[PDB]
Enzyme design. Structure first.
Site, PDB file in Angstrom:
ATOM      1  N   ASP A 181       0.804  -1.191   0.000  1.00 35.22           N
ATOM      2  CA  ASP A 181       0.000   0.000   0.000  1.00 35.22           C
ATOM      3  C   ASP A 181       0.865   1.281   0.000  1.00 35.22           C
ATOM      4  OD1 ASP A 181      -2.493  -1.287  -0.265  1.00 35.22           O
ATOM      5  OD2 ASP A 181      -3.495  -0.075   1.051  1.00 35.22           O
ATOM      6  N   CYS A 215      -1.599  -0.036 -13.706  1.00 37.21           N
ATOM      7  CA  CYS A 215      -1.770   0.023 -12.256  1.00 37.21           C
ATOM      8  C   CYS A 215      -2.985   0.915 -12.022  1.00 37.21           C
ATOM      9  CB  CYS A 215      -0.479   0.455 -11.561  1.00 37.21           C
ATOM     10  SG  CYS A 215       0.400   1.915 -12.310  1.00 37.21           S
ATOM     11  N   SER A 216      -2.972   1.861 -11.076  1.00 36.47           N
ATOM     12  CA  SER A 216      -4.139   2.750 -11.015  1.00 36.47           C
ATOM     13  C   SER A 216      -4.040   3.887 -12.051  1.00 36.47           C
ATOM     14  CB  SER A 216      -4.310   3.285  -9.587  1.00 36.47           C
ATOM     15  OG  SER A 216      -5.571   3.946  -9.503  1.00 36.47           O
ATOM     16  N   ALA A 217      -2.919   4.617 -12.069  1.00 38.08           N
ATOM     17  CA  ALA A 217      -2.735   5.686 -13.065  1.00 38.08           C
ATOM     18  C   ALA A 217      -1.981   5.240 -14.321  1.00 38.08           C
ATOM     19  CB  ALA A 217      -1.974   6.869 -12.463  1.00 38.08           C
ATOM     20  N   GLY A 218      -1.311   4.099 -14.277  1.00 32.44           N
ATOM     21  CA  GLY A 218      -0.531   3.604 -15.399  1.00 32.44           C
ATOM     22  C   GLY A 218       0.788   4.331 -15.649  1.00 32.44           C
ATOM     23  N   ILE A 219       1.444   4.839 -14.600  1.00 33.75           N
ATOM     24  CA  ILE A 219       2.747   5.508 -14.755  1.00 33.75           C
ATOM     25  C   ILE A 219       3.784   5.093 -13.719  1.00 33.75           C
ATOM     26  CG2 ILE A 219       1.736   7.475 -15.953  1.00 33.75           C
ATOM     27  CD1 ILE A 219       1.934   9.125 -13.392  1.00 33.75           C
ATOM     28  N   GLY A 220       3.359   4.708 -12.515  1.00 35.28           N
ATOM     29  CA  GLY A 220       4.313   4.410 -11.465  1.00 35.28           C
ATOM     30  C   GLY A 220       4.835   2.984 -11.397  1.00 35.28           C
ATOM     31  N   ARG A 221       4.073   2.084 -10.768  1.00 39.29           N
ATOM     32  CA  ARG A 221       4.412   0.661 -10.843  1.00 39.29           C
ATOM     33  C   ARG A 221       4.553   0.191 -12.295  1.00 39.29           C
ATOM     34  NH1 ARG A 221      -0.179  -1.303  -6.387  1.00 39.29           N
ATOM     35  NH2 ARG A 221       0.378   0.355  -4.881  1.00 39.29           N
ATOM     36  N   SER A 222       3.641   0.637 -13.179  1.00 38.13           N
ATOM     37  CA  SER A 222       3.693   0.257 -14.599  1.00 38.13           C
ATOM     38  C   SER A 222       5.016   0.677 -15.238  1.00 38.13           C
ATOM     39  CB  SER A 222       2.534   0.891 -15.367  1.00 38.13           C
ATOM     40  OG  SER A 222       1.258   0.365 -14.983  1.00 38.13           O
ATOM     41  N   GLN A 262       6.976   7.577 -10.465  1.00 37.77           N
ATOM     42  CA  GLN A 262       6.366   8.628  -9.675  1.00 37.77           C
ATOM     43  C   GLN A 262       7.083   9.049  -8.402  1.00 37.77           C
ATOM     44  OE1 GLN A 262       2.222   6.801  -9.371  1.00 37.77           O
ATOM     45  NE2 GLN A 262       1.705   8.829  -9.517  1.00 37.77           N
TER      46      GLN A 262
END
Ligand code: JHD
EC number: 3.1.3.48
Length: 284
Positions: A181, A215-222, A262
């Site tokens: 989280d 992921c949620s926004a598609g920039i960090g984990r992705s 991010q």
């Protein structure tokens, strides 16, 4: 600068925030006019995360060809990825249209549907075999075929069918379920293992359409997933660690989608994953 001495050297000062913030200043900025149009407001999950106009994926439906998704093309590595936000209830349908159009084999999901008590994504896939999904206004039916649930991730085989035409396709769903989280994992090993499974599936290979990653926004984990994959392939190309420069690869990727990686904690973790995955790559 080898990357692990450089790692050691950044880690004993504390230039991570320092390095991260530098990438941010030099990253590309291109227009996003299409994402910002009124009619498209409800297709964006976040206000500040938009696809650039030159690399956005376009639906084949003349009516509104908008989806929040970008084609990241990495010329040298012969790798392509589609990075997208977690689907909304009203774009679920759009999402599976894209997959079909682009001929993707795999979908990589790096978030859970609920995180920190809030909702991060719609439930865009079926939870039981006997309860299949049909979308609205889309002409597609999705059926769960099988799953295999492990400790760090879950892999689902799915069947996607065109109702208008009758064509069928197998889609593989790679779902990493244990990203915490807050922050980033302690060790990259689980993440490296997950990456390799995806790779072993054929999903990242050139004979198929680009893998869809989100992921949620598609920039960090992705961004972490695609950055590490590419850096390591570059590592196989010519068996040479010092030859591969992660920072420069990340800026190149940022020409296609804004905001990849991010936090500076995510950059350090990317560095970690490559150095360690690199001890596969060079013959071990
Ligand atoms: C599948 O083919 C390839 C894929 C990737 C690279 C990457 N340098 C080279 C290839 O040539 C064989």
């Amino acid at each position: 600068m080898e990357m692990e001495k450089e790692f050691e050297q950044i880690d004993k000062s504390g230039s991570w925030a320092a390095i991260y913030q530098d990438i941010r200043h030099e990253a590309s900025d291109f227009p996003s006019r299409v994402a910002k149009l009124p009619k498209n407001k409800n297709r964006n999950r976040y206000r500040d995360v938009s696809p650039f106009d030159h690399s956005r994926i376009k639906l084949h439906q003349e009516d509104n060809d908008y989806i929040n998704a970008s084609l990241i093309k990495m010329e040298e590595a012969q790798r392509s990825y589609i990075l997208t936000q977690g689907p909304l209830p009203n774009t679920v349908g759009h999402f599976w249209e894209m997959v079909w159009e682009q001929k993707s084999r795999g979908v990589v999901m790096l978030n859970r549907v609920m995180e920190k008590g809030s909702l991060k994504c719609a439930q865009y896939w079926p939870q039981k075999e006997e309860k299949e999904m049909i979308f609205e206004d889309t002409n597609l039916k999705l059926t769960l075929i099988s799953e295999d649930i492990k400790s760090y991730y879950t892999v689902r085989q799915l069947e996607l069918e065109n109702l208008t035409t009758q064509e069928t396709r197998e889609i593989l769903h790679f779902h990493y379920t244990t990203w915490p989280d807050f922050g980033v994992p302690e060790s990259p090993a689980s993440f490296l293992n997950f990456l390799f499974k995806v790779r072993e599936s054929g999903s990242l290979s050139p004979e198929h359409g680009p893998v869809v990653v989100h992921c949620s926004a598609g920039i960090g984990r992705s961004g972490t997933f695609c950055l590490a994959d590419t850096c390591l392939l570059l590592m196989d190309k010519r068996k040479d660690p010092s030859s591969v420069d992660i920072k420069k690869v990340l800026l190149e990727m940022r020409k296609f989608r804004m905001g990849l990686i991010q936090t500076a904690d995510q950059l350090r973790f990317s560095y970690l994953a490559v150095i360690e995955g690199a001890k596969f790559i060079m013959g071990d």
